[PDB]
Design a protein around this ligand. Structure first.
Ligand SMILES: CC1(C)NC(=N)N(Cc2cccc(Cl)c2)C1=O
Length: 390
């Protein structure tokens, strides 16, 4: 581990997001910022909100610059409106550099800020092609690389605790590491395997095969990437295209058939509980996603355990039972490898080589009989046909 200053700089959890501390303005104003590889805007609360105990105050920053331009960002359940400007930004537990970057000051929001999440802004780490209002608004990481010597690369280790964290425990618990400009070898075990970034906008990848406990899902590989497959720390669940979700849930139900679970559980809406310490991890199958490799006709696989796709949640009775929610959901926007999947691996976003690396996380939750895995190489043909074209 050569980046000790950035190791353990993250806090949070899959359900509410993982955040890193940042400072904006002069004198520096400290704010907790959600790490999101599924968006490209640096946006911070800039006006009083019932869920924010602090926000960016532009009138107190001598280095604030007004861009005189508004920005509207509508989501499926969320929405935030802001005013564009620039200011000096720093990451205390990151590279020792200060950069002038675009900042969307959020003045209006609907279902954006989460109560008790402890974050007041969002750091979009994806490419400018999806930046709002348009690709002319340079993303924070692009500004950082253009203004300093920081290598064009960042790596994320998101650490799920494996059990529910109460409001006090989640504030004192290390949620992971965001290494800016490098790779820290103490955050993973085994080898790093790289899959090509298919196109620079979202961090898009290509899945070429899916297995449930070693059993091939047998679907046309184009269905796994319809209409795209992305790595997104801003999304909690592993999201799969409707047809893939239906085939996967049917296979997972069949592998776990010794126990019957209510439809509400598979819909990811209701929790299931077991007497303390008796969660039957062994009846749930491991899930393997094969990704296109960097060598022609070569692929590799990442394997996650139910300890990754079953999300720990506190029982509505706060009892001593260990309870979880099924963290796999259907998508109408393609495959999304959310935080519950990223929690099993150390993920390297090598923007300089247009590739994403995967390695077993040193902090992934497992039991004494099974471990998450990243294995290769596998002979795979025509993987270029697995990609979806509108
Ligand atoms: C592409 C998709 C679904 N993934 C995201 N991380 N975001 C950004 C986002 C939206 C709503 C809430 C959050 Cl925390 C992040 C998106 O809109």
């Amino acid at each position: 581990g050569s980046f000790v200053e950035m190791v353990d700089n993250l806090r949070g959890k899959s359900g509410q997001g993982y955040y890193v501390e940042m400072t904006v303005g002069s004198p520096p104003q400290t704010l907790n910022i959600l790490v999101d590889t599924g968006s490209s805007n640096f946006a911070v609360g800039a006006a009083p909100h019932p869920f924010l105990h602090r926000y960016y105050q532009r009138q107190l920053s001598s280095t604030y610059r007004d861009l005189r331009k508004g920005v509207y960002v509508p989501y499926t359940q969320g929405k935030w409106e802001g005013e564009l400007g620039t200011d000096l930004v720093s990451i205390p537990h990151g590279p020792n550099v200060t950069v002038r970057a675009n900042i969307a000051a959020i003045t209006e929001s609907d279902k954006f800020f989460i109560n008790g999440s402890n974050w007041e802004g969002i750091l979009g780490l994806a490419y400018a092609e999806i930046a709002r209002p348009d690709d002319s608004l340079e993303p924070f990481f692009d500004s950082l690389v253009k203004q300093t010597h920081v290598p064009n690369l960042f790596s994320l280790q998101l650490c799920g605790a494996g059990f529910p964290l109460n409001q006090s425990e989640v504030l004192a618990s290390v949620g992971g590491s965001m290494i800016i400009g490098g790779i820290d070898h103490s955050l993973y075990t085994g080898s790093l395997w790289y899959t090509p970034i298919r196109r620079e906008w979202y961090y898009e990848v290509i899945i070429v095969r899916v297995e449930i406990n070693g059993q091939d899902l047998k679907m046309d590989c184009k269905e796994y990437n319809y209409d795209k497959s992305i790595v997104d720390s801003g999304t909690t669940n592993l999201r799969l295209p409707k047809k893939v979700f239906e085939a996967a849930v049917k296979s997972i139900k069949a592998a776990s058939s010794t126990e019957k679970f209510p439809d509400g559980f598979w819909l990811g809406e209701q929790l299931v509980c077991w007497q303390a310490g008796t969660t039957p991890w062994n009846i749930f199958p491991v899930i393997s996603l094969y990704l296109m490799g960097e060598v022609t006709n070569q692929s590799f696989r990442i394997t996650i355990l139910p300890q990754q796709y079953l999300r720990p949640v506190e029982d509505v009775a706060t009892s001593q039972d260990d309870c979880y929610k099924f963290a796999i959901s259907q998508s109408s926007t393609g495959t999304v490898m959310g935080a519950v999947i990223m929690e099993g691996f150390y993920v390297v976003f090598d923007r300089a080589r247009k590739r994403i690396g995967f390695a077993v996380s040193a902090c992934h939750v497992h039991d004494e009989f099974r471990t998450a895995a990243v294995e290769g190489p596998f002979v795979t043909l025509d993987m270029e046909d697995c990609g979806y074209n509108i």
